[PDB]
Amino acid sequence: ANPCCSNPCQNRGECMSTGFDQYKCDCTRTGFYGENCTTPEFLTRIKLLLKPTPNTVHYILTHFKGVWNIVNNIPFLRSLIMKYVLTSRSYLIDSPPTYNVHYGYKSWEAFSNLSYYTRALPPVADDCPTPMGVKGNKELPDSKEVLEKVLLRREFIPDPQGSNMMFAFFAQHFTHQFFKTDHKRGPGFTRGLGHGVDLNHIYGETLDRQHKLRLFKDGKLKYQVIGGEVYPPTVKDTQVEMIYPPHIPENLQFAVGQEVFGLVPGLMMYATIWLREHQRVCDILKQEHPEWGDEQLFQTSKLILIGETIKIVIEDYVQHLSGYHFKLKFDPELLFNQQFQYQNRIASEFNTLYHWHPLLPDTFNIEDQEYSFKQFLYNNSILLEHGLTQFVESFTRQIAGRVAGGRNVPIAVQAVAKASIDQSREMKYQSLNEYRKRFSLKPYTSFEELTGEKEMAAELKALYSDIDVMELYPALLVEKPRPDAIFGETMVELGAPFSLKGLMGNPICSPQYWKPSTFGGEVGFKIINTASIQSLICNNVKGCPFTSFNVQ
Amino acid sequence: ANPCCSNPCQNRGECMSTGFDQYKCDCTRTGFYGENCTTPEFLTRIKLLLKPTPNTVHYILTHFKGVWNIVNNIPFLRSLIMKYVLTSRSYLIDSPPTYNVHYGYKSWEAFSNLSYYTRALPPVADDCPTPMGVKGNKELPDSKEVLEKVLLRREFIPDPQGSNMMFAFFAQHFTHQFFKTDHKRGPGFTRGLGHGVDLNHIYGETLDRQHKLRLFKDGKLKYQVIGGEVYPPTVKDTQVEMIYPPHIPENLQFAVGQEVFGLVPGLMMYATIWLREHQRVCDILKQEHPEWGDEQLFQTSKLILIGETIKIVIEDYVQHLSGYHFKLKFDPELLFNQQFQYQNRIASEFNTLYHWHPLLPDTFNIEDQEYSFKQFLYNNSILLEHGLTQFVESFTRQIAGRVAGGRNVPIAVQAVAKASIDQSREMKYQSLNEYRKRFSLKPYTSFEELTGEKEMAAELKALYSDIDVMELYPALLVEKPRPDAIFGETMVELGAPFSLKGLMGNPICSPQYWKPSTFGGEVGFKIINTASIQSLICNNVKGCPFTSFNVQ
Ligand code: HEM
Ligand code: HEM
Ligand SMILES: NS(=O)(=O)c1ccc(-n2nc(C(F)(F)F)cc2-c2ccc(Br)cc2)cc1
Ligand SMILES: NS(=O)(=O)c1ccc(-n2nc(C(F)(F)F)cc2-c2ccc(Br)cc2)cc1
Ligand SMILES: *[C@@H]1O[C@H](CO)[C@@H](O)[C@H](O)[C@H]1NC(C)=O
Ligand SMILES: *[C@@H]1O[C@H](CO)[C@@H](O)[C@H](O)[C@H]1NC(C)=O
Ligand SMILES: *[C@@H]1O[C@H](CO)[C@@H](O)[C@H](O)[C@H]1NC(C)=O
Ligand SMILES: *[C@@H]1O[C@H](CO)[C@@H](O)[C@H](O)[C@H]1NC(C)=O
Ligand SMILES: *[C@@H]1O[C@H](CO)[C@@H](O)[C@H](O)[C@H]1NC(C)=O
Ligand SMILES: *[C@@H]1O[C@H](CO)[C@@H](O)[C@H](O)[C@H]1NC(C)=O
């Protein structure tokens, strides 16, 4: 019934049910007017008729090495550039957050209840004619008819950017502090209440849990020595609850912080990395402040690490996943003179679209041995046996799958990829084009437009019929990759904005926190600003292995 | 021991313990440098040597009626002015919030734990030589040697601004959504987790409770008809827990929302006001959207009411409490082009300094009768008997005490006034001057400077000895009143900044929410912007009595 079913209002205008059969578009603060918020004000016209495509943008940004070389040299230019990528990229986020799974209208419950995931686009009214609003059939294609037909891998497709397993597992561990779906409540419900890079994954989801992992000495995190290496405390020792198969030796049962992380040795490898990083900081802090107490050292360290994390995640991770030329820069002071909300609330889309299982290899090959999913998952001795350095090295040299090519999901994790499809449907998501429009992209004219090939296109077209009924999730993995990109424009466009407001819109990035001392000193401050995944490992791993987020 | 005990760093520079015996000042982002952040950069000099005193500011603002008249006529001027009062006033707030009772250093716990009250000035290190850091004696004056000597009232002193009982009880009910100290945890701990004007006081502190008050019909709040007037549901009826003396008839036991509000008939009078306002909106919304459901009408209503509340609290409450000439204006779009954080976290100072018991009369005189505290407190039949209109009228005509004159605290509420003193001491607060400096005010040279008279000055001087050991709280009520002001500069300066970021720094005030429709329509939006305490009553109270926040 709901007259706004049909998503009438374009250009961002909010739609409203003015009488069962009627609706009105709140074109307020859009650049357009007229019943559907579509006809522009001259200024708009001028902007529009002078705006370059994310691709025409991407081209420049990925070409002209030498020039970008010159820019990367000129500091008073790199910053100008960085400042801009930052500023514009995030105008697309509604922070303060609007909407969630149960609120299609602004609502204070949608604003207060931190247990939800914000949502870039309001769900589809439960009283609509079709699940995509008005277009489509009484039902949508079947999940497996998309999962198998268009999503499951045949031959392992390698990423054309050389994303290794170091990167792959990092993107998993990292995003896993904010992504934490509270399934007991349902999809759309999170447990990463601190909506953002709160390093909760290392430090326990609470205070109570955070305490059960702390040594309460020199600001240190509890650890344990196995043969000669520091490994996380045991659930048996520090009663911090974990998730482990009812047979794991109880000596495997590592503690780490984020309760799921024990289900994959890659994760557990990274926690052991950071666990060690904390202490390492703690000591530095401890000899810069011989008079600090445990609680201070601890509280200052978590700040520093977070500081480091935002650096690596921009200077290395985004830098790699971008494949630019221009050198991205983690510099909070760049946003200081601009309007910015040092506030964030993670959406469900960001979660969904971040399901990068296509990154996953068919064998977890730790040099001089390859393991099956069945063997790698929930394994104690794998990590303990091989060693950290022999993980760092294996992973530096191991191509991970390309993401948005088509049909590259590990037949194992096909179940997950399944859920994703039929779960995002449960959460009543919107059509792939409404999202494209929403993120200032132009909707696709054909499944063929979406894919850049004919085979799948026709397979999907067969199923979905209308392009305007294609889903955000599938369309993302079976999307035409920009050049030798790991994924296409649609992925890259919805996610860039979301991934920067969670990094930058973080208290430490605030002008009130961004100063030495907040980090114990000038010292601590100059740890954040010298961070790199390269150092993270050379500082914490038995050798000082070379590493990267690229396959050498 | 802590080298930062003596609060060395001036001009905002954060102080840090660099070695037991040493410290450094983080003059970063201040206008000053040099060991203590005190010597200015030329630009600073220029600003300073060109900035007008809050008094030299106040004078203009309270004088020249005719000019201000001209201004209040010119809309393209009033706004310019309003925009300014807004912008500058709040540069003084650390949002994102830094500090709380347990954190003298930035800390992530201080940032995360929403159960705390932020704190404009960090507490005094528990290892200091004197409770005020380094100045003063092993102890401070006694509470009663201040409570009695300088704070308890003798003759009722009337406010020179004509603040009536309508205003008095409004300032109580209103601030009582944000102020809600969780004493079980201790002072410094709140229960108004939605740090701000979340109208939780009308709607229950939760979701669970909010449900136990709603009708789940037409978006309406539950009510009950007693003789002919709508009065809140009964605890017995709506199991919403309340706080009532173990003898109250169980028919008194009104529900309303904020659990304490039953302990004073004035509070209960105002809740009954709003309860009725909700419904009144709900019906308007209900015949604007004949197709809305209860949950939508309810969710849209709370937003409109909040909208109204911010209007009244600026346009009437602040407007009256200011005694300006220039017509303040609630216009969220004024901050749209300025850097602003639509985010807030209520401090403990704001709470403490807002203890305006001096406002309280010795008799709650509802025309043709006068009640004792003993009688007015927790009374059923008072309100039910007299009626709302006969409360509105009594209160419009009833002068309330002056606040910051000296010695005007009701001997009843002396206990509260006591707590305040020795509680803010518990929370380890700082000297009256550190705060004055903190809020860009010049510290006092004598108790005499503080008071503007000689009697009390010497009585306090006797006690405190050093002016620099005078406390924020007492010095606030025993402070020299600006002209015919209800309180002086110190109160007005710490609070103005705090009271605006809680109003403006609210999601609905955001450019993402500030549009029609968010409020159900242009209609709902045009309720917020036509709001007034005058209307609030004429729309909800049996007559349509004239009212104000001034004694006629
Ligand atoms: C050993 C490899 C991995 C396994 C076995 C695995 C398994 C799973 C499973 C069981 C789910 C839940 C199913 C659902 O979403 O409905 C899931 C969710 C997810 N996975 Fe993985 N995953 C792995 C690696 C990764 C990596 C490398 C990334 C990150 C780049 C990733 C990102 C996600 C995301 C974002 C979700 C949603 C998390 C949430 O709901 O909060 N996964 N994965
Ligand atoms: C009938 C008049 C009133 C009575 C009997 C009363 C009584 C009290 C009592 C019992 C307390 C708790 C003691 C403590 O703080 O440790 C208190 C706290 C407080 N009162 Fe009042 N009060 C009255 C009016 C007011 C008014 C008019 C204001 C506001 C302008 C005010 C503001 C406060 C504040 C801010 C607190 C702290 C609330 C909290 O802890 O969250 N009071 N009052
Ligand atoms: N064409 S590509 O696939 O190689 C590609 C191109 C650019 C980016 N990139 N650049 C930016 C920046 F410019 F804003 F920094 C943000 C992201 C980004 C990061 C994480 C997510 Br999730 C989504 C986007 C990523 C991939
Ligand atoms: N000299 S005075 O006592 O009469 C006096 C003068 C001005 C104000 N006033 N003006 C403003 C505004 F200008 F920003 F609107 C805010 C406050 C304000 C409101 C609440 C608290 Br709590 C503290 C300050 C209040 C009293
Ligand atoms: C909005 O879309 C509807 C489709 O039914 C159309 O009738 C209406 O005229 C459109 N308005 C504008 C401004 O595009
Ligand atoms: C959030 O909302 C859901 C649904 O109303 C509810 O079950 C849950 O209790 C809420 N969470 C909080 C913290 O109020
Ligand atoms: C776990 O690792 C051990 C030794 O590293 C291996 O024998 C075993 O097969 C692995 N677990 C599974 C389930 O394959
Ligand atoms: C800075 O202030 C502190 C206050 O404790 C004092 O010890 C120090 O001598 C001052 N230094 C200067 C240069 O004013
Ligand atoms: C806030 O801190 C206090 C003291 O550490 C603790 O009792 C309480 O659980 C904390 N609140 C939350 C929500 O963590
Ligand atoms: C409550 O009010 C009634 C009637 O207004 C009055 O007679 C009675 O004394 C009051 N209660 C107390 C405890 O004084």
Side-chain angles (χ1 to χ4, degrees):
Chain A
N2 171 14
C4 284
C5 273
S6 30
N7 300 232
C9 314
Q10 304 305 291
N11 289 314
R12 301 292 270 147
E14 260 102 12
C15 185
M16 222 22 199
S17 26
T18 75
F20 285 107
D21 45 67
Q22 228 87 342
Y23 80 94
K24 280 192 177 293
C25 297
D26 209 30
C27 313
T28 41
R29 218 146 302 141
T30 64
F32 307 80
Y33 53 112
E35 182 181 10
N36 293 354
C37 315
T38 41
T39 94
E41 305 152 349
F42 238 134
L43 167 65
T44 313
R45 303 182 232 187
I46 301 160
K47 304 183 179 305
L48 306 205
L49 308 179
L50 223 96
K51 91 127 304 178
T53 314
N55 305 292
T56 65
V57 156
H58 198 288
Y59 184 96
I60 309 169
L61 219 29
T62 329
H63 293 267
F64 320 89
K65 165 169 293 180
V67 157
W68 293 108
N69 271 323
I70 291 174
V71 147
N72 290 10
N73 108 55
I74 289 198
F76 60 106
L77 261 182
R78 176 179 160 194
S79 52
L80 264 193
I81 302 285
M82 183 76 233
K83 210 190 71 177
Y84 187 89
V85 297
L86 251 31
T87 54
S88 50
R89 198 115 299 149
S90 296
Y91 88 76
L92 301 299
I93 306 85
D94 271 6
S95 208
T98 54
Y99 321 101
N100 62 39
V101 189
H102 304 126
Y103 295 88
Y105 44 39
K106 302 277 185 60
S107 148
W108 184 275
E109 162 68 20
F111 179 81
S112 48
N113 204 317
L114 293 185
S115 301
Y116 288 128
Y117 272 117
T118 198
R119 189 103 107 49
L121 283 189
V124 175
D126 300 38
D127 69 60
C128 289
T130 72
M132 277 305 105
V134 279
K135 287 181 179 191
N137 284 277
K138 175 185 300 299
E139 297 82 12
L140 230 56
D142 182 83
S143 312
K144 280 188 179 296
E145 281 296 278
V146 196
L147 196 201
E148 286 174 353
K149 309 249 171 164
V150 135
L151 301 162
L152 273 168
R153 84 192 310 151
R154 322 301 180 182
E155 202 146 308
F156 166 114
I157 283 167
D159 159 48
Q161 308 197 222
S163 296
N164 45 28
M165 280 304 271
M166 213 48 144
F167 171 115
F169 275 136
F170 194 107
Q172 187 191 200
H173 162 89
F174 172 67
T175 54
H176 278 45
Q177 63 194 356
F178 22 114
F179 299 124
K180 275 175 70 155
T181 303
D182 160 16
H183 310 99
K184 103 185 68 172
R185 235 86 152 272
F189 281 110
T190 175
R191 313 176 80 60
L193 286 166
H195 292 236
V197 194
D198 62 11
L199 289 257
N200 102 65
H201 60 47
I202 291 167
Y203 302 110
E205 325 84 41
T206 59
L207 185 252
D208 200 311
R209 169 161 184 140
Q210 176 243 29
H211 283 344
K212 297 189 290 173
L213 295 166
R214 198 184 333 162
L215 187 49
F216 288 127
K217 258 292 271 304
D218 305 28
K220 295 181 173 309
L221 219 23
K222 220 120 72 301
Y223 55 40
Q224 79 164 290
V225 173
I226 306 179
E229 320 289 335
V230 149
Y231 282 104
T234 47
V235 73
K236 184 184 170 302
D237 180 52
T238 69
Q239 301 83 349
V240 38
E241 251 197 66
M242 271 305 233
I243 323 175
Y244 284 116
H247 65 256
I248 257 79
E250 299 184 346
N251 325 316
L252 152 42
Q253 304 205 58
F254 287 155
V256 305
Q258 219 280 36
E259 220 185 47
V260 83
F261 289 13
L263 307 161
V264 176
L267 261 6
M268 194 58 63
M269 172 230 171
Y270 258 141
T272 300
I273 299 292
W274 297 106
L275 162 82
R276 305 154 96 139
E277 185 64 326
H278 189 85
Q279 274 65 302
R280 176 188 137 283
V281 179
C282 284
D283 299 309
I284 306 168
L285 254 31
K286 196 234 61 198
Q287 203 22 232
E288 265 289 300
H289 302 87
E291 14 77 30
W292 269 3
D294 169 74
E295 250 274 11
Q296 176 145 30
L297 285 168
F298 174 95
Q299 292 282 349
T300 310
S301 292
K302 171 160 181 170
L303 284 184
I304 291 186
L305 259 58
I306 294 188
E308 293 177 273
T309 302
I310 305 191
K311 183 88 140 189
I312 295 176
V313 163
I314 290 271
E315 304 279 36
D316 297 303
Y317 186 110
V318 179
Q319 181 60 260
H320 165 281
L321 195 126
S322 82
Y324 277 167
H325 255 131
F326 166 58
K327 202 185 328 173
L328 297 189
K329 178 173 65 166
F330 175 39
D331 190 8
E333 301 195 1
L334 300 184
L335 283 167
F336 286 2
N337 94 297
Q338 246 110 31
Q339 318 186 255
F340 182 66
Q341 301 300 321
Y342 297 86
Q343 151 197 208
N344 180 75
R345 191 93 120 243
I346 71 189
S348 9
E349 347 292 39
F350 202 59
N351 174 267
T352 260
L353 85 80
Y354 231 96
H355 294 8
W356 299 348
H357 298 104
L359 277 164
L360 291 172
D362 297 276
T363 16
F364 300 102
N365 157 53
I366 269 71
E367 315 297 61
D368 201 73
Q369 211 157 26
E370 292 197 73
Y371 301 87
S372 61
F373 272 68
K374 292 70 196 186
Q375 296 178 299
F376 208 57
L377 298 205
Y378 336 119
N379 212 315
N380 187 29
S381 229
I382 292 185
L383 184 57
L384 293 176
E385 281 308 293
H386 286 152
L388 257 270
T389 10
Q390 202 30 276
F391 241 84
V392 178
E393 303 205 282
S394 301
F395 297 173
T396 307
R397 306 89 196 196
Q398 180 155 347
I399 319 113
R402 179 194 201 117
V403 170
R407 334 149 91 120
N408 194 37
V409 175
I411 289 84
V413 180
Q414 69 155 320
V416 173
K418 180 154 163 273
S420 313
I421 313 178
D422 53 312
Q423 217 154 229
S424 297
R425 292 172 155 183
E426 186 190 357
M427 295 211 282
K428 302 239 72 288
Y429 272 48
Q430 299 203 322
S431 147
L432 172 79
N433 292 125
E434 268 311 309
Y435 273 85
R436 282 181 62 65
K437 292 145 75 71
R438 167 68 236 276
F439 286 73
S440 310
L441 306 177
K442 187 189 288 299
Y444 289 140
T445 61
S446 52
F447 282 81
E448 304 113 270
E449 257 253 278
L450 168 71
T451 54
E453 55 90 69
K454 256 306 177 307
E455 221 235 45
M456 294 183 243
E459 176 54 39
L460 281 170
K461 177 192 172 179
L463 293 155
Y464 289 78
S465 293
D466 187 21
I467 174 67
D468 297 324
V469 190
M470 187 56 217
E471 306 183 38
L472 169 70
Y473 181 74
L476 271 154
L477 301 179
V478 58
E479 208 219 338
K480 176 198 165 180
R482 285 170 145 167
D484 287 291
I486 181 157
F487 26 66
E489 145 209 63
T490 293
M491 170 81 97
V492 173
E493 293 297 290
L494 294 219
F498 290 5
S499 213
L500 297 182
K501 269 212 61 66
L503 280 30
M504 293 324 242
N506 186 286
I508 89 164
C509 295
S510 80
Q512 331 114 213
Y513 282 70
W514 195 234
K515 60 183 60 195
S517 82
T518 312
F519 309 116
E522 190 68 76
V523 193
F525 193 43
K526 299 314 179 182
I527 282 186
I528 287 67
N529 309 284
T530 49
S532 64
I533 212 305
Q534 169 61 77
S535 312
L536 192 68
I537 259 76
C538 250
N539 268 328
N540 288 286
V541 208
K542 192 67 209 315
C544 193
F546 148 89
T547 343
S548 194
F549 287 145
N550 201 301
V551 86
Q552 263 202 291
Chain B
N2 172 13
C4 286
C5 272
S6 44
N7 302 229
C9 314
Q10 307 297 295
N11 290 316
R12 301 292 271 144
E14 262 101 10
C15 181
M16 223 29 220
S17 25
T18 75
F20 286 107
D21 49 62
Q22 224 88 354
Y23 83 93
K24 293 185 169 296
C25 298
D26 208 28
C27 310
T28 37
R29 220 145 302 136
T30 63
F32 310 80
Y33 52 116
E35 185 183 9
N36 291 352
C37 316
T38 39
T39 94
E41 305 148 350
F42 238 134
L43 167 66
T44 312
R45 305 177 220 195
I46 302 163
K47 296 180 191 301
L48 308 203
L49 307 177
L50 224 95
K51 86 135 300 171
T53 313
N55 308 290
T56 63
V57 156
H58 196 291
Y59 183 88
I60 310 169
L61 218 30
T62 326
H63 294 267
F64 320 88
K65 163 164 285 178
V67 155
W68 290 111
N69 274 312
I70 292 176
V71 148
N72 292 7
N73 113 54
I74 290 198
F76 62 105
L77 258 182
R78 178 179 158 195
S79 47
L80 262 195
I81 300 287
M82 184 72 227
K83 210 193 63 176
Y84 187 87
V85 301
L86 250 33
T87 53
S88 49
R89 197 114 300 150
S90 295
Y91 88 74
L92 298 302
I93 305 86
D94 271 6
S95 209
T98 52
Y99 324 100
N100 60 37
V101 190
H102 300 124
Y103 295 86
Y105 44 42
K106 303 275 181 63
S107 143
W108 182 275
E109 165 65 26
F111 177 79
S112 53
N113 202 319
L114 289 187
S115 303
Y116 288 126
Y117 274 115
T118 197
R119 189 104 103 53
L121 284 188
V124 175
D126 300 43
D127 69 59
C128 288
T130 74
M132 279 306 103
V134 282
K135 288 183 175 188
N137 294 274
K138 176 176 295 304
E139 292 76 13
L140 230 55
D142 182 59
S143 313
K144 274 187 182 291
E145 289 289 299
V146 197
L147 196 199
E148 284 174 356
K149 318 233 148 180
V150 134
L151 299 159
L152 273 167
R153 84 190 309 155
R154 323 301 178 182
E155 195 151 330
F156 168 111
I157 284 164
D159 159 44
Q161 308 197 227
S163 304
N164 47 31
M165 282 305 272
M166 213 48 146
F167 172 115
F169 279 130
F170 194 108
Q172 187 191 202
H173 162 88
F174 173 66
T175 57
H176 277 43
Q177 63 195 352
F178 21 114
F179 298 126
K180 272 173 69 158
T181 302
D182 163 15
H183 314 111
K184 99 187 53 199
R185 234 89 153 270
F189 280 111
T190 174
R191 309 177 82 60
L193 288 167
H195 293 234
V197 190
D198 63 12
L199 288 260
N200 102 63
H201 60 45
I202 292 166
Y203 303 109
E205 327 80 44
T206 57
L207 187 250
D208 195 299
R209 171 165 182 137
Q210 173 249 25
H211 281 346
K212 297 198 294 174
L213 295 163
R214 196 197 318 183
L215 189 53
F216 288 128
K217 270 286 293 286
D218 311 22
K220 292 181 175 305
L221 219 22
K222 221 117 75 302
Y223 54 45
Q224 79 165 289
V225 172
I226 302 176
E229 318 294 337
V230 149
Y231 282 103
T234 44
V235 74
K236 174 184 184 305
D237 183 84
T238 55
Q239 295 78 359
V240 40
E241 235 185 83
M242 271 304 234
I243 324 174
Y244 284 116
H247 63 254
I248 266 65
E250 298 190 340
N251 323 314
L252 156 41
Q253 313 221 49
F254 288 151
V256 307
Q258 220 281 38
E259 220 182 45
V260 85
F261 292 10
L263 306 159
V264 174
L267 259 9
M268 195 61 66
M269 170 231 174
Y270 259 141
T272 302
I273 298 296
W274 296 110
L275 163 80
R276 304 158 99 140
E277 186 58 324
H278 191 84
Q279 273 68 300
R280 176 190 137 281
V281 178
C282 279
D283 302 308
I284 304 164
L285 254 32
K286 193 238 63 202
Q287 202 27 228
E288 266 296 303
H289 300 87
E291 16 73 32
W292 269 3
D294 168 76
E295 251 278 9
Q296 176 147 29
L297 288 170
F298 174 93
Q299 293 285 348
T300 312
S301 289
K302 171 160 185 167
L303 284 184
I304 292 182
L305 259 57
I306 293 185
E308 296 177 278
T309 301
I310 303 188
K311 178 87 134 192
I312 292 172
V313 166
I314 289 275
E315 304 276 37
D316 296 313
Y317 187 106
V318 179
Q319 180 62 262
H320 163 278
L321 194 128
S322 80
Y324 278 164
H325 254 134
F326 166 58
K327 207 191 317 180
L328 298 188
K329 188 176 66 162
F330 171 41
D331 189 9
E333 301 182 16
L334 298 183
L335 281 168
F336 287 179
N337 94 318
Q338 249 87 44
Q339 316 186 257
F340 182 63
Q341 302 302 318
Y342 298 87
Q343 153 192 210
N344 181 71
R345 191 92 124 242
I346 73 197
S348 8
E349 345 293 37
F350 200 57
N351 171 271
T352 260
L353 87 78
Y354 231 95
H355 293 7
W356 296 351
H357 299 105
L359 275 164
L360 289 172
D362 296 278
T363 20
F364 298 103
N365 155 54
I366 271 72
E367 316 299 62
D368 194 77
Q369 210 154 7
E370 295 203 83
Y371 302 87
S372 65
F373 271 68
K374 291 66 190 202
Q375 292 177 300
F376 208 58
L377 300 204
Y378 337 115
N379 211 315
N380 188 27
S381 232
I382 292 185
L383 184 57
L384 297 176
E385 288 300 304
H386 285 150
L388 259 271
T389 11
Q390 199 33 276
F391 241 84
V392 177
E393 291 185 307
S394 302
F395 296 174
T396 309
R397 306 93 199 183
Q398 181 150 353
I399 318 116
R402 184 177 198 138
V403 171
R407 335 162 84 123
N408 198 35
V409 174
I411 291 87
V413 182
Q414 68 157 320
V416 172
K418 172 154 169 281
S420 312
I421 311 177
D422 52 300
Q423 213 152 233
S424 297
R425 294 171 152 182
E426 207 189 334
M427 296 207 281
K428 299 240 73 289
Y429 270 50
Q430 296 198 322
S431 150
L432 173 73
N433 291 125
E434 269 308 306
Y435 273 87
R436 279 183 64 64
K437 290 147 81 67
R438 166 70 235 272
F439 285 74
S440 308
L441 305 175
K442 186 185 296 304
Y444 290 140
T445 60
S446 53
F447 282 84
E448 304 116 86
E449 258 253 277
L450 169 69
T451 57
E453 56 91 72
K454 255 313 172 303
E455 231 246 17
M456 294 184 243
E459 179 45 53
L460 278 171
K461 182 190 170 185
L463 292 153
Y464 288 80
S465 291
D466 189 8
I467 174 63
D468 299 326
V469 189
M470 186 53 211
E471 306 187 38
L472 169 70
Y473 181 74
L476 272 155
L477 300 182
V478 59
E479 209 222 336
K480 177 198 163 178
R482 287 171 144 169
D484 278 278
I486 181 153
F487 27 67
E489 150 211 57
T490 296
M491 167 87 101
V492 172
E493 295 297 294
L494 298 215
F498 290 11
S499 210
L500 298 186
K501 269 210 65 63
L503 280 30
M504 293 325 241
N506 187 284
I508 91 162
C509 285
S510 84
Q512 332 102 233
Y513 283 70
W514 197 235
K515 57 185 62 196
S517 80
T518 313
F519 310 118
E522 190 66 77
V523 195
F525 192 45
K526 300 316 169 178
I527 283 190
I528 285 69
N529 309 278
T530 47
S532 64
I533 212 308
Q534 168 62 80
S535 307
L536 193 66
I537 257 76
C538 252
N539 270 327
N540 287 282
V541 209
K542 191 64 213 316
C544 190
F546 149 88
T547 343
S548 192
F549 286 146
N550 205 302
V551 86
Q552 258 196 320

